[PDB]
C-alpha cells in the first residue's frame, strides 16, 4: 500500500472520532435543556462532558498509534522508500495535534455553556 493512504485513513478516522464527540455533546445539551439548572447538577454535567472529552482523546490516540503501526509495517517493504516513513509519523502527529485541539475547543465551548 501507499504512505499517503496511511495519512488519509488517520484523518478520516480522527475526523470521525471528533464529530462523534461533538454529536454526543449536542444531544447532551438537549437532555440538559429539560432539567433545572442546579449547582450540584452543574457539577454533574461538567464531570460527564470532561469524561466524554477523554474518551474522544483516547479514540484519537488509538488512531495515531494504529497509523504508526501501519507506517512501521511498510518498513519491511523494499517497494517502500524507508526514507519517507518519518514524514508519515510527522503528518499523523500534525493531524493528532489538530484533532485534540478541536476536541479541546468543543469542550471549552461546552463548559462555557454549562456554567453560563
Amino acid at each position, epitope marked *: 500500500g501507499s504512505i499517503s493512504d496511511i495519512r488519509k485513513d488517520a484523518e478520516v478516522r480522527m475526523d470521525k472520532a471528533v464529530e462523534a464527540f461533538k454529536n454526543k455533546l449536542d444531544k447532551f445539551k438537549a437532555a440538559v435543556r429539560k432539567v433545572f439548572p442546579t449547582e450540584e447538577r452543574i457539577k454533574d454535567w461538567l464531570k460527564i462532558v470532561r469524561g466524554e472529552a477523554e474518551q474522544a482523546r483516547v479514540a484519537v490516540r488509538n488512531v495515531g498509534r494504529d497509523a*504508526n503501526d501501519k507506517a512501521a509495517a511498510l*518498513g519491511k517493504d523494499k517497494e517502500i*522508500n*524507508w*526514507f519517507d*516513513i518519518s514524514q508519515s509519523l*510527522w503528518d499523523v502527529q500534525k493531524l493528532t495535534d489538530a484533532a485534540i485541539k478541536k476536541i479541546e475547543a468543543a469542550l471549552a465551548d461546552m463548559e462555557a455553556w454549562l456554567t453560563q
Partner: antibody
Amino acid sequence: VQLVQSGAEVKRPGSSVTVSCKASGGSFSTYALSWVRQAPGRGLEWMGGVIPLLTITNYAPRFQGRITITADRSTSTAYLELNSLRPEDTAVYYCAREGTTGLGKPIGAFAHWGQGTLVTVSS
Amino acid sequence: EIVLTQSPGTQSLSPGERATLSCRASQSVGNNKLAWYQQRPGQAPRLLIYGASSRPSGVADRFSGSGSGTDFTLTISRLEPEDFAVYYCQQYGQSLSTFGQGTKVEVKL
C-alpha cells in the same frame, strides 16, 4: 541537535563492535537515524538506519546478516552492532540524523552528524 | 540499486573561480532525493543541499544544486579558501541509500 558518539575501539577479526550515539537536544522518537562509515582515505558508505518510535529498521543488503540497529527512547541513544568483523571493516563510523524544515518536517538528508567512531580491526 | 557517479574526480581552482560539480545516477533518483555534502579533512560531512535544490539555513548562498532525474550539479559560485574539501552526493530515493565516490576540490595558495 547534537550527536555524540562512543570512543575509539580496537577489535580482532571475528569480534563484534557496538557503537553508541546519543542525541543531545532535539526530538528523538520520530526522526530517522542512520549509520554511515568511511574506511581510511575512502568514500562515505551508508550502512543502515532506524526510526526509534517503533524500531523501524533498514539495512543495506551487503551488511544484512551482520548488522543490528536499535534505539533506547528514554536515553535518546541509537546503537550499531556490527558482527563478525574483518579488516575491511576498518573505518570511521558516523551516526547521522535527518534534518527538519526550519520538531519540523523531516527532509531525509543527514543534517546532523556525530564525531565518528574509529573502529580498527587489527590482525 | 542506484550507483551514483561523480565527475570530475579532482578539481584544481583558485579562490574566486566558479566550481561546478557533477553527480550522475545509473537510474532515476526517486523524487529527486539527492543530497550534497561537504567534508573537510579530518571532519564529519556537512549538509549543503537537499531534495536536489534546497539549501538549509546556515549554508552560504554561494552553494546551489540543480538537475533532476539521473543528472545533477552542485555549483560553488565564488570559491573561498575554506571550500577546499571533498564533496559527495547521496541519494535516499529508495530504501538503499548510496553515495557518490567523491570529487575533491583543490583551491590554491
